[PDB]
Swiss-Prot record, chain A:
Family: Belongs to the splicing factor SR family.
Subcellular location field: Nucleus
Name of protein: Splicing factor U2AF 59 kDa subunit
Primary role: Necessary for the splicing of pre-mRNA. The SF1-U2AF59-U2AF23 complex has a role in the recognition of the branch site (5'-UACUAAC-3'), the pyrimidine tract and the 3'-splice site at the 3'-end of introns.
Superkingdom of source: Eukaryota
Subunit structure: Forms a heterodimer with the U2AF small subunit. Can also form a homodimer. U2AF large subunit (U2AF59), U2AF small subunit (U2AF23) and SF1 (bpb1) interact to form a complex required for complex A formation. Interacts with wat1/pop3.
Transmembrane segments: none
From Swiss-Prot, chain B:
Subunit structure: Forms a heterodimer with the U2AF large subunit. Can also form a homodimer. U2AF large subunit (U2AF59), U2AF small subunit (U2AF23) and SF1 (bpb1) interact to form a complex required for complex A formation. Interacts with cwf13.
Protein name per the record: Splicing factor U2AF 23 kDa subunit
GO annotation terms (biological process): mRNA 3'-splice site recognition; mRNA cis splicing, via spliceosome; mRNA splicing, via spliceosome
Stretch of the intact protein here: 15 to 194 of 216
Compartments it resides in: Nucleus
UniProt keyword annotations, A-Z: Metal-binding, mRNA processing, mRNA splicing, Nucleus, Repeat, RNA-binding, Zinc, Zinc-finger
The keyword Zinc-finger belongs to this UniProt entry's keyword annotation: yes
Function: Necessary for the splicing of pre-mRNA. The SF1-U2AF59-U2AF23 complex has a role in the recognition of the branch site (5'-UACUAAC-3'), the pyrimidine tract and the 3'-splice site at the 3'-end of introns.
Source taxon at top rank: Eukaryota
Keyword RNA-binding carried by entry: yes
GO molecular function list: pre-mRNA 3'-splice site binding; zinc ion binding
Length: 55, 180
């Protein structure tokens, strides 16, 4: 319904001052940081290795 | 033959696979669990050198890093970080997405990734209502059960940060919906 084309419009102008979350500067992001020596090791291999067990 | 109330309500059971009761993982869910993702600084070699303000800033940074990342898989309705002492819950991160497809896309991507030098574990979770799942003591007063507690000890970020993240996601979602 083209109704939604303008419920989008009301949303977008009520948020004109707002930074979208994909452009949010993160204070401290730690995603995809690997320990040294694991350049050739996948996440699954590391999990299967037993070195990173869940409590 | 009786459903494990704790697995289905909280997404975690103190008995693990040794439980006498039924744990069946869903093949579809709006909610995921990344077990033990959150490592509270307090319990680390450095942790007691930090002031309360430093600790609060560190947690806001963690919560932000989580919410912003999970948003890339789809609309995030709620994010809960467990600060329990017990092994079954300590550091558990739960995310409820609007759509089941988001949750599946998330665990498939997350299971191939690392976070702060540890590989990420992610699974679909049976949890449907964080209100039921969260420890009402830990909210209202303090829970003094420690590892005995079977409910989530939700650690909350600065309210302004959460409001800002929700707004930022609303903007992101609106800009995406405006692509057609
Ligand atoms: Zn159980
Ligand atoms: Zn409790």
């Amino acid at each position: 319904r083209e109704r939604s084309v303008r419920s989008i419009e009301q949303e977008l102008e009520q948020l004109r001052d707002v930074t979208p979350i994909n452009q949010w500067k993160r204070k401290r992001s730690l995603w995809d940081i690997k320990p040294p020596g694991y350049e050739l090791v996948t996440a699954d291999q590391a999990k299967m290795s037993g070195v990173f067990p869940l409590p | 033959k009786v459903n494990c109330s704790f697995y289905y309500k909280i997404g975690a059971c103190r008995h693990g696979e040794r439980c006498s009761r039924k744990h069946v993982k869903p093949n579809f869910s709006q909610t995921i669990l990344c077990p033990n993702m959150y490592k509270n600084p307090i319990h680390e070699p450095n942790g007691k050198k930090f002031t309360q303000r430093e600790l609060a800033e560190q947690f806001d940074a963690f919560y932000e890093d989580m919410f912003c990342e999970f948003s890339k898989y789809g609309e995030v309705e709620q994010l809960v970080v467990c600060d329990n002492v017990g092994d079954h819950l300590v550091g558990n991160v739960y995310v409820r997405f609007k759509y089941e497809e988001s949750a599946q896309n998330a665990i498939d991507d997350l299971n191939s990734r690392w976070y702060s030098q540890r590989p990420v574990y992610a699974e679909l979770s049976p949890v449907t209502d964080f209100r039921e799942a969260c420890c009402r003591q830990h909210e209202t007063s303090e829970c003094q059960r420690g590892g005995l507690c079977n409910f989530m000890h939700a650690k909350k970020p600065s309210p302004q940060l959460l409001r800002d993240l929700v707004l930022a996601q609303r903007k992101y979602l609106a800009l995406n919906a405006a692509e057609e």
